[PDB]
Ligand binder design. Structure first.
Ligand SMILES: [Zn+2]
Lengths: 217, 124, 102, 62, 81, 52, 97, 245, 88
């Protein structure tokens, strides 16, 4: 009932301001023909009422996936997005959000032999949006399990703290794959939300209402 | 709590001319804003103990099931590989350059406030 | 000293925001000092226009961006034009800017 | 390895609970705080030329 | 100035984290199925069986196994091969 | 100055910024230093009256 | 101590000015500090690998060895590639040892 | 005797005299939701209007909005209550949202009740204390009610009229049925010529009648084109309907 | 003069007694205001997409157990054990 007090200019407030303004920047509003004044202001407010909140949705999916992907790089923790139902469940849910948005631009009726081939390539982006997040979080972590099993075979067989130039070259290769996994954790949360603005932004187009009567000169 | 300019105006009006210039530092301090003083510490809040015991209850539970995972020595040596980058990030990230880089992501902190330019609001 | 309370409340309040904004000012002190600016900012978040200044920047509306900022601080002049209207009503006249042709 | 989960609907619903909490937390807790301090700065930077000129025309001190 | 006001309130969780943790726990306990490695039996079997025979060896792996596949319990020796 | 007000903010008492200085990123300008020093003289309102 | 206040002051002086890149000299051998941290990193892994193995050494490895054996074992339960075989051999070895 | 005991319980415990005895605690909650269920009951709204009069001076803004639109639907005009309501609005005008003030004015426009201090504190609140795009979220049948209430009472406030005329567009009039759009366009042009204020968005309320003139009569279109010529020289130009092409 | 009844609840100075409580947004106050003004008018496409996935993955969980029940019955009506006898 009593909300907490926020310092202005906090670092999480500055990061999320720049993050939100980035994903809002991906589907910008289109400039009308008329100058924007008090005549055109309800047409601009109604143009914003009919646009999807892709600025909010894409930073929902940025912040929920970069938090899940970076959990896999914390010790004692696995990424939730290395699960098949989690990662592909976010990809189908973006694709269904784009489709529900594109189906409502009409009256919820679904759109010769061409259109089964536009549909297939369109229905596969349900699969590809989530599987790309799942495979990247699985295939990077699986290779790290294999190469740290093979790196453990050397000090198990040889001495502890002995014949160290053999294990050093594979402990730096293991260390450089965890570092690549930090890059893939941030990139795949970016590629998921860049592509969510592209897919949802395809149906983010309505008619500008505008002035139907004008006193010229 | 009425406003402090009307407290300045009232408290300057009811002083004599002889003690005007002596009173001006106690009228200045009566209308200064409150900056609350550094209280007693009483550290680690009731929710900061849930956060630290709950993270220790999570780390012990995840290390418990990692140790019987059929690749337990491979799992437990991955926490060494993952915590090595948490150590190598405290020693390589420029934390003052990162603080001022996030500070420029927000337009509220990328510039100074801009209104009210002091020649428009004089009272002569 | 007739309207010195309003002109010096504007001066002292902005000088305290500017000294502390983006450094250590709490959000509670902003909403204390400027309650109707926070009220109008919260209207945009409630009514799904939280990116309205980004929308006017997308469509290049630089004069509607200046009107958006000016109409959100337009209550700063309300203690003056409620005072000057109660002067002119007490002196039998009409307030000037209230009228269309005046 | 582990590829399919024990329940796909339980993992899909964990994703929908986590992402709808982040949607609620952003819209309700974060973005009101973002916009309270973004738009104090933005309204002051957009009005500053017309605020000061309106105030110059109003105060009679000159 | 104002720095000592923000040190007074300490750590605090995000403002609705109790609904996230109650929502993730309610998905992990209201599964509507037995608890991953167990099977529902009748009460006549549950009251008749020792707790050493109710356990399976697969569900109790050894905490730091010297051989991969070591289990802590052995369960019912009455096998149906 | 601005960097001198940042140094006493809660951000620079945090652990990763505790040995840092805000002047190391963008130093205060020559006018910003001379106007913080001029504003120190005028925090005495008697000195501000006799100057004016 | 105050359990909150002492360790923060203790860890801070360990974190900030306690540097074994200078308290142990060590600029004589390494060029930068940017590659002292890239060897303390790999050094943390090799020490952490060698501690986790040695803290329980007589174990049959889950990971594939490449046909190599640790010490004078070579035919025992520690080197057995079949895991149901080595469980029977470990249970014989355990009552003797 | 099961039917006898229930019928005896029904004639002495569940009546409307005890329905108004539990409704004495919070009045504007129970006043608002009952009247939305069709409970007009003018003798019961007398009982409401006295148990709330020691409370109107300390009500929240959503309570005052709940009182007035309940006492509008119940059509019961309690004049010494309704001056306590306008003394809540005039004392707390900064806290009232213009979504709430457009429902309070439409009650005060039904029962022709106005102060001059109330007409300024509603116009000061819509213009200065509220967001300038909040007329755009209003719906033009409520804004036209506010325009006549300032023209009935002869209150010329040119700052309020520039604010309310923002909310008239093709968007806000298009959400109206053509019966309700007709009762609004004639009601908004009659107020815009009473003050002689012809904003640039009067061409959306004039143009709402000139695309579909077949629901308007001859003297109503004589009332429309009186305003159209009065606005063309004021805006310094010539009216032209746009057809989209 | 202009005398503080005109500045009331419009312009306040920085506080001198104590720092007040933060003013809540209407969404932080009640979930019902968030749900009816923003969650359902603006984000129902996203809630519809989360609903589609949970129902679709309940189809695929229903297909997977009807395929488990199919292969189970064709081992007990074939005189075989339906799994690999545990392993241990
Ligand atoms: Zn792992």
């Amino acid at each position: 009932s009593s909300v907490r007090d926020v310092k202005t200019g906090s670092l999480p407030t500055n990061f999320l301001t720049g993050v939100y303004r980035f994903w809002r920047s991906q589907n910008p509003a289109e400039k009308p023909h008329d100058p924007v004044n008090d005549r055109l202001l309800p047409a601009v407010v109604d143009a914003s009422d009919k646009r999807a909140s892709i600025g909010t949705w894409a930073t929902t999916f940025f912040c929920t996936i970069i938090s899940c992907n970076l959990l896999g790089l914390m010790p004692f923790n696995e990424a939730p997005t290395s699960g098949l139902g989690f990662a592909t469940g976010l990809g189908v849910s973006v694709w269904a959000t784009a489709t529900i948005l594109g189906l409502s631009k009409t009256g919820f009726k679904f759109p010769f032999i061409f259109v089964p081939l536009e549909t297939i390539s369109y229905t596969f982006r349900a699969v590809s949006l989530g599987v790309r997040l799942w495979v990247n979080m699985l295939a990077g972590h699986t290779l790290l399990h294999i190469l740290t099993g093979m790196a453990l075979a050397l000090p198990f067989s040889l001495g502890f703290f002995s014949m160290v130039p053999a294990t050093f070259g594979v402990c730096c290769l293991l260390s450089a794959l965890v570092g690549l996994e930090y890059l893939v954790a941030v990139l795949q949360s970016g590629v998921f939300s860049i592509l969510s603005t592209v897919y949802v932004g395809e149906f983010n187009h309505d008619k500008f209402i505008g002035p139907a009567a004008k006193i010229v000169k | 709590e009425g406003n402090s300019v009307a407290g300045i105006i009232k408290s300057v009006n009811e002083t004599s001319g002889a003690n005007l210039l002596s009173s001006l530092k106690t009228i200045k301090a009566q209308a200064a804003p409150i900056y609350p003083a550094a209280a007693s510490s009483t550290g680690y809040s009731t929710q900061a103990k849930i956060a630290l015991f709950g993270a220790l209850s999570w780390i012990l539970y995840r290390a418990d099931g990692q140790s019987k995972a059929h690749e337990w020595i491979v799992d437990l040596n991955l926490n060494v590989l993952q915590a090595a980058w948490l150590i190598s990030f405290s020693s390589l990230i420029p934390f003052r350059a990162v603080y001022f880089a996030f500070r420029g992501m927000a337009p509220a902190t990328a510039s100074t406030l801009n209104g009210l330019k002091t020649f428009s609001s004089i009272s002569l | 000293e007739e309207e010195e309370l309003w002109l010096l409340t504007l001066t002292q309040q902005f000088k305290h925001i500017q000294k502390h904004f983006g450094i250590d000012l709490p959000h509670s002190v902003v909403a204390h000092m400027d309650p109707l600016l926070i009220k109008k900012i919260d209207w945009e978040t409630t009514n799904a226009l939280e990116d309205f200044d980004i929308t006017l920047d997308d469509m290049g509306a630089e004069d509607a961006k200046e009107q958006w900022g000016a109409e959100n601080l337009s209550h700063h002049f309300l203690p003056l034009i409620r005072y000057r209207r109660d002067l002119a009503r007490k002196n039998g006249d009409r307030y000037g800017p209230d009228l269309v042709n005046g | 390895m582990k590829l399919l989960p024990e329940s796909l609907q339980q993992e899909a619903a964990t994703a929908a609970v986590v992402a709808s909490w982040v949607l609620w937390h952003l819209d309700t807790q974060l973005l009101p705080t973002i916009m309270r301090e973004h738009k104090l700065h933005a309204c002051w930077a957009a009005a500053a030329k017309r605020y000061n000129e309106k105030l110059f025309k109003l105060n009679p001190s000159y | 100035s104002y720095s000592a006001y923000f040190a007074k309130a300490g750590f605090q969780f995000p403002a609705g984290l109790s609904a996230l943790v109650a929502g993730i726990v309610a998905l992990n306990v209201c599964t509507g199925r037995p608890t991953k490695g167990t099977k529902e039996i009748s009460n006549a079997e549950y009251n008749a069986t020792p707790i050493g025979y109710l356990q399976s060896p697969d569900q109790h792996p050894t905490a730091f196994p010297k051989v991969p596949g070591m289990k802590d319990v052995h369960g019912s020796p009455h096998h149906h091969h | 100055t601005f960097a001198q007000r940042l140094n006493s903010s809660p951000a620079f008492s945090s652990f990763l910024l505790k040995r840092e200085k805000a002047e190391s990123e963008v130093p205060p300008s020559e006018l910003e230093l001379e106007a913080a020093q001029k504003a120190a003289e005028l925090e005495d309102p008697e000195v501000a009256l006799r100057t004016l | 101590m105050a359990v909150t206040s002492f360790l923060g002051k203790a860890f801070e002086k360990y974190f900030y000015d306690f540097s074994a890149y200078e308290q142990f000299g060590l600029n004589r051998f390494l060029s930068s500090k940017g590659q002292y941290v890239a060897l303390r990193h790999v050094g943390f892994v090799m020490v952490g690998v060698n501690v986790l193995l040695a803290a329980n050494f007589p174990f049959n490895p889950p990971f594939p060895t490449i046909g190599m054996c640790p010490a004078g074992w070579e035919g025992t339960w520690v080197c057995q590639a079949d895991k149901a075989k080595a469980l029977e051999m470990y249970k014989e070895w355990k009552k003797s040892n | 005797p099961s039917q006898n005991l229930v019928s005896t319980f029904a004639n002495k415990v569940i009546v409307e005299e005890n329905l108004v005895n539990v409704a004495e605690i919070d009045v504007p909650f129970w006043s608002y939701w009952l009247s939305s269920a069709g409970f007009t009951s003018k003798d019961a709204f007398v009982k409401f209007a006295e148990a709330v009069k020691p409370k109107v001076a300390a009500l929240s803004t959503s309570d005052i909005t709940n009182l007035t639109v309940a006492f509008k639907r119940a059509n019961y005009y309690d004049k010494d209550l309704f001056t306590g309501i306008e003394a809540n609005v005039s004392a707390n005008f900064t806290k009232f949202e213009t979504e709430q003030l457009l429902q309070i004015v439409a009650t005060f426009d039904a029962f022709n009740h106005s102060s001059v201090a109330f007409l300024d504190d509603v116009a000061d609140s819509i213009t200065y204390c509220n967001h300038y795009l909040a007329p755009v979220r209003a719906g033009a049948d409520e804004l036209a009610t506010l325009l006549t209430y300032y023209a009935k009472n002869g209150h010329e406030r040119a700052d309020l009229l520039a604010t309310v005329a923002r909310g008239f567009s093709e968007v806000s009039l298009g959400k109206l049925s053509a019966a309700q759009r007709k009762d609004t366009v004639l009601s908004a042009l009659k107020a815009f010529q009473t003050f002689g204020f012809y904003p640039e968005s009067i061409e959306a309320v004039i143009g709402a009648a000139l695309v579909s003139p077949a629901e308007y009569s001859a003297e109503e279109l004589k009332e429309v084109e009186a305003v159209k010529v009065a606005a063309e020289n004021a805006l310094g130009g010539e009216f032209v309907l746009i057809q989209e092409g | 003069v202009l005398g503080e009844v005109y500045l009331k609840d419009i312009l306040r100075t920085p506080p001198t007694g104590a720092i007040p409580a933060n003013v809540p947004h209407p969404f932080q106050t009640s979930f019902y205001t968030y749900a009816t003004k923003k969650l359902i008018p603006r984000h129902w496409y996203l809630l519809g997409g989360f609903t589609f996935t949970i129902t679709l993955y309940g189809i695929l969980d229903g297909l997977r157990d009807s395929g488990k029940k199919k292969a189970y019955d064709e081992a007990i009506h074939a005189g075989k054990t339906p799994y690999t006898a545990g392993g241990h």
